[PDB]
Design an enzyme around this catalytic site. Structure first.
Site, PDB file in Angstrom:
ATOM      1  N   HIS A 150       0.833  -1.201   0.000  1.00 21.24           N
ATOM      2  CA  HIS A 150       0.000   0.000   0.000  1.00 21.24           C
ATOM      3  C   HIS A 150       0.870   1.254   0.000  1.00 21.24           C
ATOM      4  O   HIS A 150       0.392   2.357  -0.275  1.00 21.24           O
ATOM      5  CB  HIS A 150      -0.908   0.000   1.219  1.00 21.24           C
ATOM      6  N   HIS A 201       5.992   6.865   6.277  1.00 22.97           N
ATOM      7  CA  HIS A 201       5.644   6.457   4.922  1.00 22.97           C
ATOM      8  C   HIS A 201       4.999   7.657   4.246  1.00 22.97           C
ATOM      9  O   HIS A 201       4.738   8.672   4.897  1.00 22.97           O
ATOM     10  CB  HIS A 201       4.644   5.285   4.944  1.00 22.97           C
ATOM     11  CG  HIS A 201       3.359   5.598   5.652  1.00 22.97           C
ATOM     12  ND1 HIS A 201       3.218   5.492   7.019  1.00 22.97           N
ATOM     13  CD2 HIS A 201       2.184   6.088   5.190  1.00 22.97           C
ATOM     14  CE1 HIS A 201       2.012   5.906   7.369  1.00 22.97           C
ATOM     15  NE2 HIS A 201       1.365   6.273   6.277  1.00 22.97           N
ATOM     16  N   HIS A 247       2.143   9.092   0.945  1.00 23.87           N
ATOM     17  CA  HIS A 247       0.954   8.884   0.133  1.00 23.87           C
ATOM     18  C   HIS A 247       1.163   9.815  -1.043  1.00 23.87           C
ATOM     19  O   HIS A 247       1.506  10.972  -0.817  1.00 23.87           O
ATOM     20  CB  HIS A 247      -0.338   9.283   0.852  1.00 23.87           C
ATOM     21  CG  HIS A 247      -0.593   8.439   2.096  1.00 23.87           C
ATOM     22  ND1 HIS A 247      -1.272   7.241   2.050  1.00 23.87           N
ATOM     23  CD2 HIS A 247      -0.233   8.618   3.388  1.00 23.87           C
ATOM     24  CE1 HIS A 247      -1.325   6.720   3.263  1.00 23.87           C
ATOM     25  NE2 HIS A 247      -0.700   7.535   4.093  1.00 23.87           N
ATOM     26  N   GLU A 287      -3.474  13.377   1.602  1.00 21.21           N
ATOM     27  CA  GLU A 287      -4.701  12.857   2.177  1.00 21.21           C
ATOM     28  C   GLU A 287      -5.471  14.028   2.770  1.00 21.21           C
ATOM     29  O   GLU A 287      -6.638  14.235   2.444  1.00 21.21           O
ATOM     30  CB  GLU A 287      -4.377  11.796   3.219  1.00 21.21           C
ATOM     31  CG  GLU A 287      -3.638  10.626   2.590  1.00 21.21           C
ATOM     32  CD  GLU A 287      -3.878   9.326   3.317  1.00 21.21           C
ATOM     33  OE1 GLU A 287      -3.517   9.233   4.506  1.00 21.21           O
ATOM     34  OE2 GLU A 287      -4.437   8.404   2.695  1.00 21.21           O
ATOM     35  N   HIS A 327       3.841  10.787   6.537  1.00 25.20           N
ATOM     36  CA  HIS A 327       3.278  10.456   7.838  1.00 25.20           C
ATOM     37  C   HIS A 327       4.332   9.816   8.731  1.00 25.20           C
ATOM     38  O   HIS A 327       4.870   8.756   8.401  1.00 25.20           O
ATOM     39  CB  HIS A 327       2.099   9.481   7.687  1.00 25.20           C
ATOM     40  CG  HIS A 327       0.863  10.105   7.113  1.00 25.20           C
ATOM     41  ND1 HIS A 327      -0.191   9.362   6.625  1.00 25.20           N
ATOM     42  CD2 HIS A 327       0.517  11.403   6.946  1.00 25.20           C
ATOM     43  CE1 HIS A 327      -1.131  10.175   6.176  1.00 25.20           C
ATOM     44  NE2 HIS A 327      -0.726  11.420   6.358  1.00 25.20           N
ATOM     45  N   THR A 382      -5.448   6.154   8.334  1.00 21.06           N
ATOM     46  CA  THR A 382      -6.129   6.370   7.043  1.00 21.06           C
ATOM     47  C   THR A 382      -6.162   5.146   6.139  1.00 21.06           C
ATOM     48  O   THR A 382      -6.613   5.220   4.994  1.00 21.06           O
ATOM     49  CB  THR A 382      -5.492   7.547   6.289  1.00 21.06           C
ATOM     50  OG1 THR A 382      -4.169   7.199   5.874  1.00 21.06           O
ATOM     51  CG2 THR A 382      -5.447   8.783   7.189  1.00 21.06           C
TER      52      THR A 382
HETATM   53 ZN   LIG Z   1      -0.290   7.424   6.073  1.00 22.95          ZN
END
Ligand SMILES: [Zn+2]
Length: 258
Positions: free
Chosen positions: A62, A92, A94, A104, A117, A196
């Site tokens: 992911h 990590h 996104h 996000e 994050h 999330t």
């Molecule tokens: Zn995250």
């Protein structure tokens, strides 16, 4: 068959396997800067990362995580709206398929190219597993990335992505200093939210920094070369691994600045 960011297993489908997806304190959310309230009682954030010990980087399907040794208070977050000490366990990102999307959280509906994050857990609970079951178990520091000048401190991360292209791959990643990913100012917005990604537990105190950091087009481009799939499987580029903003509901966003 499981959750992901595709058309058939994306965020809009998560509620079927994880009912909490429609909960009361889900993340991310849109930060309305004119509705956020300045709270004079909020203390400055205390980021102590001088003794941080990175261990590995892994593609878990992911996103990719850079893991740290959290067996002692080596890298911790204190202050701000937090009560107690929170240890850094992993960070990590996104990101999107285009520079116009990827983050996000949004600020006045504005989307950034990516969002970093840094996940920390409350030491009072002994371990990460117990912490996620508590309303004040985690503290995630969120940092926005915009495309512009390159960020030197991020290059070590981008250069190793080739070695963990597919899901399941991991590589030694020692001596990485996370202090190189922080903006100059630590002003922030904070609210009670959730993870999330599934299990989407509502155990997070979000701390979103106002000042984004800049990364170059070339740096973000390398993020987009990763795969959601495992080796030997049809290639699926890892892009747009972000969840859309959720209803704020009965929550107030506080700002540490005027
Ligand atoms: Zn995250």
């Amino acid at each position: 068959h499981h959750w992901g960011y595709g058309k058939h297993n994306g965020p809009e489908h998560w509620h079927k396997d994880f009912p909490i997806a429609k909960g009361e304190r889900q993340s991310p959310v849109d930060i309305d800067t004119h509705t956020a309230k300045y709270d004079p009682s909020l203390k400055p954030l205390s980021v102590s990362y001088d003794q941080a010990t990175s261990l590995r980087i892994l593609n878990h399907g992911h996103a990719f995580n850079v893991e740290f040794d959290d067996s002692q208070d080596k890298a911790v977050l204190k202050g701000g709206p937090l009560d107690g000490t929170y240890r850094l366990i992993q960070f990590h990102f996104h990101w999107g398929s285009l520079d116009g999307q990827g983050s996000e959280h949004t600020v006045d509906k504005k989307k950034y190219a990516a969002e970093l994050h840094l996940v920390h857990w409350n030491t009072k609970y002994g371990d990460f597993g117990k912490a996620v079951q508590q309303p004040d178990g985690l503290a995630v520091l969120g940092i926005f990335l915009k495309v512009g000048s390159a960020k030197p401190g991020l290059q070590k991360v981008v250069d190793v992505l080739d070695s963990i292209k597919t899901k399941g791959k991991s590589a030694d990643f020692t001596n990485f200093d996370p202090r190189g990913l922080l903006p100059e100012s630590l002003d922030y917005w904070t609210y009670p939210g959730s993870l999330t990604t599934p299990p989407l537990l509502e155990c997070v105190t979000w701390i979103v920094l106002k000042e984004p950091i800049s990364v170059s087009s070339e740096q973000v481009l390398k993020f987009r070369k990763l795969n959601f799939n495992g080796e030997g499987e049809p290639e699926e580029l890892m892009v747009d691994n972000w969840r859309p903003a959720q209803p704020l509901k009965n929550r107030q966003i506080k700002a540490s600045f005027k």
